[PDB]
Amino acid sequence: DRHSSLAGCQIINYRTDAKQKWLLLTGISAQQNRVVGAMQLYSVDRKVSQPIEGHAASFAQFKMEGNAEESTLFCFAVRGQAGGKLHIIEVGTPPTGNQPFPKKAVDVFFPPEAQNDFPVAMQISEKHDVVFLITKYGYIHLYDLETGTCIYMNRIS
Amino acid sequence: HTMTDDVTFWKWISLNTVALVTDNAVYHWSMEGESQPVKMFDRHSSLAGCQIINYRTDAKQKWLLLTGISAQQNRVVGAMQLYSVDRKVSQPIEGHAASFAQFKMEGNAEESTLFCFAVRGQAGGKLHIIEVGTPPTGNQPFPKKAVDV
Amino acid sequence: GGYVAPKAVWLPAVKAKGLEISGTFTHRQGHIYMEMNFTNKALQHMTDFAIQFNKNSFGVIPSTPLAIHTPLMPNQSIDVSLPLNTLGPVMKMEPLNNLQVAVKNNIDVFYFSCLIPLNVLFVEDGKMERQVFLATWKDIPNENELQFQIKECHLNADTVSSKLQNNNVYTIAKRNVEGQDMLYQSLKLTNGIWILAELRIQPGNPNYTLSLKCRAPEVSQYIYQVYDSILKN
């Protein structure tokens, strides 16, 4: 069943783990002038569920320069009271000989004509380590997945 | 029960216990309570395809014998498996026909555990009687025997 | 008290921007702890400490936030007891007792793994009734029985039984058979899995045979390892 912290929320994604033994439901609200995201993390073997945050994020596999194994990154973007920030991070223990990936943050810019605007979708190219971000207005930005350095931003919609 | 493979023989090794021989294992089943058939060992390949014909254990159920014969090139060749349950190790036939006895040797207080086995081999048929494992403490060992059959 | 391993280095300073973690596990009166020492080998203060585990075979999690309240100054070294429980999400790891960890501070997130010794998962109510022991050993498929060798042991059965008792491995019965001691023993994991054991101690033999029956025989290898460690320590 849908956990009440979600009630009235824009459902925007549904995700499981590989075993389907955990389930994630997400949705966002326009709560008091910000895009607040709600998540439901359901345990299927425990039969217990909890509430959590947010909105445009995806996971990659990236081989860092001198390692043999592909670090599992979790890249997510939000606009908060501090303004819009993208985070890339390792998730879980590095495969054994791997030198850990430094966590990253960068700010995502929203113009003054971008008055409300916030993140909405993310996709990463594995072919070219790049983070594609789409906002609510129809703005795009690409960031370098390893070093979150901005590489372009423009309106396409 | 309902075994998951047909059992190609069985014999009541004791007052309460049922040996099941499947195509590829042997299992004891007790009669007693809710307990179900227990695998004691898998079938040793020299038996494969054989007419199983007997299963036998020692009084302690600490050695198990499976037997079974073939019509190999015009002869009724008998195979045997001799499983050691505490050692967890199993030989093809070193004694095919064999049984164990307790015997009190003439001036001893304690019954020596004999292992009698009979084989025909290239040297022809030989029965062997032997002591198995250390004599009880004051006991004079039993001389190992061998005779031709 | 049961066996506790010496602390070992889990995270070296040079891998973790000057953070060094050493650790062991303990079981104190029905309570599991991850016992660590954190040392700041960096030139910055360290703050904002936090920890999590990946999903794991025995559902091990921290039961509270990590209790580091004050900045860990350069050169400083603190001893941290983190309480654990087994209520957390289960995913079967390889090895079965491996635990993946992430530790954060104000500089970065770092990761490491360590191996949980299974005796901290041996529960207080792990003594089987003799009756139930015989029935359960007989109910468990004989193919599940696994044999192991405790090499170079010279403890008497009494001393084996008292040391194992102190680790919640209970002796149910003892059988003298011709100078051999047989010890029949039960223990119970935090997940409710029972393990039954037959130890065989033979005159002249410096090695004891440990025979383990479990419904989940994959675990048996790890019981043997800590059984061996308890006898040898």
Residue numbers in the entry:
A (entry chain Y): 143 to 299
B (entry chain Z): 102 to 250
C (entry chain B): 705 to 937
Please share text taken word for word from the publication where this structure appeared.
Clathrin‐coated pits are formed by the recognition of membrane and cargo by the AP2 complex and the subsequent recruitment of clathrin triskelia. Clathrin cannot recognize membrane or cargo itself and so an adaptor protein binds the membrane, selects the cargo, and associates with clathrin leading to pit formation. The unstructured hinge region contains a clathrin‐box motif (CBM, LLNLD) which binds the N‐terminal domain (NTD) of clathrin heavy chain. The appendage is divided into platform and sandwich subdomain, each with a tyrosine residue previously identified to be important for clathrin binding.
